[PDB]
Amino acid sequence: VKPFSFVRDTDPVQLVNFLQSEHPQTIAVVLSYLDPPVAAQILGALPEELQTEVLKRIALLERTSVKEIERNLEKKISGVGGIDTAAEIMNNLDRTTEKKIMDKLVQENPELADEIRRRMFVFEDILKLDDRSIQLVLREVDTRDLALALKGASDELKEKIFKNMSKRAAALLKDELEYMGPVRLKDVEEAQQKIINIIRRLEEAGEIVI
């Protein structure tokens, strides 16, 4: 079973009560093991002074120093946490708290802040992109992944994507949808994740405009 799994079984406040007086690092460890919405809920309820530091430690969980990297590597060779975890927690925080943590990271860890922000991109964020960028992305997506990803998108996002496809691609997509049928929710999920990865890569290449 997974560590800290008894957390959803534990009380609400007594939970924040104990974590409050623990070392930030110890806090980072416990939260990085929980479902993000749960972690975001706890994080936002922690004393303001711990929020940023704890979020940063979650982001750099086993990357804190060259020594830590060297040690962790050796373990895996012989016998959790990270940027994604942090970004997922930030997406589930209330806007206000999220903004405060991001503003501080921008000031003290500008790079890490940038890694987290870019990792925070969700499928609906595609609505933030301009039409040209969207077309750029579409050329990198196969018909089936697109169809799957769309079964989990808002009608508005559906539209903005459609009006940006080539006539031939749109026809192929429509065909897929017609003979696709019901699908496992997790397929819709990885399809969207796949498109998101394409976006994350196209911006690392500095060719994606918001």
Author numbering: 105 to 169, 173 to 186, 195 to 325
Copy text from the publication.
FliG forms a ring on the cytoplasmic face of the MS ring. directly involved in the switching of the flagellar motor. generation and in stator assembly around the rotor.
deletion at positions 169 to 171. deletion, indicating that the motor is locked in the CW state. to the one introduced by the in-frame PAA deletion. is different from that of Tm-FliGMC. is also different in these two structures. here, we propose a new model for arrangement of FliG subunits in the motor. interaction between helix E and FliGM of the neighbor. the orientation of the neighboring FliGM domain. orientation of FliGCC to cause anomalous switching behavior. change in the interaction between FliGCC and MotA.
